[PDB]
Amino acid sequence: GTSKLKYVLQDARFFLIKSNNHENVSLAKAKGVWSTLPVNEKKLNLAFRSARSVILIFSVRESGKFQGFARLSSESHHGGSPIHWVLPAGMSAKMLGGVFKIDWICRRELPFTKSAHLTNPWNEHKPVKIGRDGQEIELECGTQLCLLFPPDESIDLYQVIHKM
Ligand SMILES: CNc1nc(Cl)nc2[nH]cnc12
């Protein structure tokens, strides 16, 4: 069912995450962590304090799909065991130094062809698939986007609800 999912998404904020490679999204699914560039790190830290839930919606660039979505469970933190991100050109380990803990809500894919009816008011009402890493997605668009994903029956949202 979808009731606990809707409860988690109630009054949530949503951010598009654009990863350069599949490797880091796979690492994030395995370890429950994400790192972004400093401009987006600051925005996500502000949002984490401001809302009941901050949702990251992941898309690997050129994949034509979203790969899932997750909820921040922490602000970014440094000094952990370095996460072995595969680095794009021009991107360094120091830039990805801040580590967010995340709880996955859906690890299933959604093709862009299935979200073509959803536009994001915070990006000039372009299709929600369009946006830079870190682009915020307005509440209604983001809620409907998350509800389009196939159900992930491996996930139990009971523990996530109690973190809100
Ligand atoms: C682990 N974080 C990231 N990894 C990659 Cl491959 N690309 C990005 N663009 C913004 N953040 C990232």
Helix/strand/coil (H, E, C) string of 24-59? HHHHHHHHCEECCCHHHHHHHHHHHHHCCCEEEEEE
Nearest Cα residue to 44 out of 145, 135, 164, 141: 135
Domains of the chain by residue range: 1-164
Are 54 and 13 in contact by the 8 Å Cβ rule? The answer is yes
Substitution candidate for ligand 1 out of 19, 23, 25, 100 with most atoms within 8 A of CB: 19
How many Cβ atoms are within 10 Å of 28's Cβ, its own excluded?
A: 25
Question: What's the burial of 65, exposed, middle or buried (CB within 10 Å: 0-12/13-18/19+)?
Answer: middle
**160 CA → ligand 1 middle, Å:** 24
Is the shortest distance between the CB of 39 and ligand 1 below 6 Å?
A: no
Nearest Cα residue to 47 out of 15, 95, 8, 7: 15
Are 134 and 15 in contact by the 8 Å Cβ rule? The answer is yes
Is the shortest distance between the CB of 133 and ligand 1 below 6 Å?
A: yes
122 labelled binding-site residue: no
For residue 116, what are its two tokens?
């073509």
Residue whose Cα lies nearest atom 6 of ligand 1: it is: 20
Q: Which residues are 16's β-sheet partners?
A: 57
Residue 122 is given by DSSP the state G
One-letter amino acid identity for 112?
F
60's CB contacts (< 8 A; 6+ apart) are 18, 19, 20, 21, 22, 25, 67
Counting from 1 in the atom list of ligand 1, the atom nearest the Cα of 133 is 10
